[PDB]
Design a protein around this ligand. Structure first.
Ligand SMILES: O=C(O)CCCC[C@@H]1SC[C@@H]2NC(=O)N[C@@H]21
Ligand SMILES: O=C(O)CCCC[C@@H]1SC[C@@H]2NC(=O)N[C@@H]21
Ligand SMILES: O=C(O)CCCC[C@@H]1SC[C@@H]2NC(=O)N[C@@H]21
Ligand SMILES: O=C(O)CCCC[C@@H]1SC[C@@H]2NC(=O)N[C@@H]21
Lengths: 123, 121, 123, 121
């Protein structure tokens, strides 16, 4: 449900995700991270399943942030892959990969993995 | 300057990734997977570092495909996160997460992880 | 602390982890999964940092279960990588990789990733 | 039978993995990393499927190294999870998780993920 996803969300670190779900499956918005080499808002773009299953399955989605805006550039990008689970206590449960640009010799330690849970604030 | 990310790329499974890199960091294009519950092309969108470091570092990037088009809907989405390494034989090295829409009970087994290497050959 | 790790632990799915931490850095024990193609106990072996930092850092550890015992064989193995965080509310926070044996053509979808949090029961 | 997992293997970074596979599923040996905060050999222990499927499937396995030995202590541990594929050119294909001991504040950045391919060359 585009309107189910569309809104302001926060995760367990205190980061803010503002997203709009388009009817063609597009996600666009901004992300503000509470941690890491980041300041202010960053552009995000992603995609979601705009026709999910009618049962109690979640809606699969994903989005990317490259950590460069007009104030800072961390030379890194994170992708979040997860699912939206609707209802009263709407949640988006994700796992993420954060890759930093590195020299070829340091490429083995270029990528962090983690997981974030997002809670929606009253839309 | 010199981000030769724009083009048609192929990974080791034979999937085709056609991307345009915008001057301000946007990635847009289409993806056609040679494997999985997929047929024909799917829309992708992503982001990349449009001013990378001047030392020998790769360019960080990432993108998403939701596997729904006019033919099929797999109820899943993949994100690739990696770096572009330019040069005479340019490559995009990625790790990816493929999440399927599941019930809560099956959420523990909702996400596959793998790694794809893209070259222009 | 070997004695800090040693004990019975349960995660959010209802699975049971019984572990003994050896003074040489060895972990041995048994694992019972509440989900998946598993029944009864399975042998686990792992390693941990037996001399962690004296600050508030966690103790890094990891262990493996191959899902074959005398009752069932799922032809898969999981490795958990994480850290033990001591105290009153002792926790082990992990991420895991579950690989299934597959044919070469299905090898792209061989591995699941997830995360489990373990709580210790009164030792 | 035929699990030719036992031996000395090398990955793409030039690290050396010396393993013995026990008849009942145990893996034991040593690991020497060519990269990272590591020197000399470290103890590894793991598990593998000692009765794999009879179709063309690989053998699932996994092992752990805690990066402490008599020389150094990195306060970290790596787990590799993968499958052994036998044949004329046998390979072990893995994905790994490297967790460092961190404070709670830094737990979000405690875990690296990568992938190693081992061959006997
Ligand atoms: O340090 C960087 O390279 C950029 C900031 C990264 C912030 C990460 S993205 C995953 C995790 N979730 C968050 O909300 N913030 C951190
Ligand atoms: O089966 C699905 O759910 C949709 C197709 C998934 C194809 C995956 S995405 C990661 C990997 N890289 C590819 O080029 N194809 C597979
Ligand atoms: O289905 C299988 O192949 C074997 C059982 C797998 C159980 C997994 S391991 C990770 C997760 N944590 C658990 O406690 N159980 C599941
Ligand atoms: O730096 C550390 O914390 C200890 C050494 C880590 C070496 C890693 S483990 C994964 C990868 N594969 C290797 O052979 N070496 C690196």
């Amino acid at each position: 449900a585009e309107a189910g996803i569309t809104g302001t969300w926060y995760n367990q670190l205190g980061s803010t995700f503002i997203v709009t779900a388009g009817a063609d499956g597009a996600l666009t918005g901004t992300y503000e991270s509470a941690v890491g080499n980041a300041e202010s808002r960053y552009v995000l773009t992603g995609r979601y399943d705009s026709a999910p299953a009618t049962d109690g399955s979640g809606t699969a989605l994903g989005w990317t942030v490259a950590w460069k805006n007009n104030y800072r550039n961390a030379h890194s990008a994170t992708t979040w892959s997860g699912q939206y689970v609707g209802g009263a206590e709407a949640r988006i449960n994700t796992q993420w990969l954060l890759t930093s640009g590195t020299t070829e010799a340091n490429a083995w330690k270029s990528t962090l993995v983690g997981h974030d849970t997002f809670t929606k604030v009253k839309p």
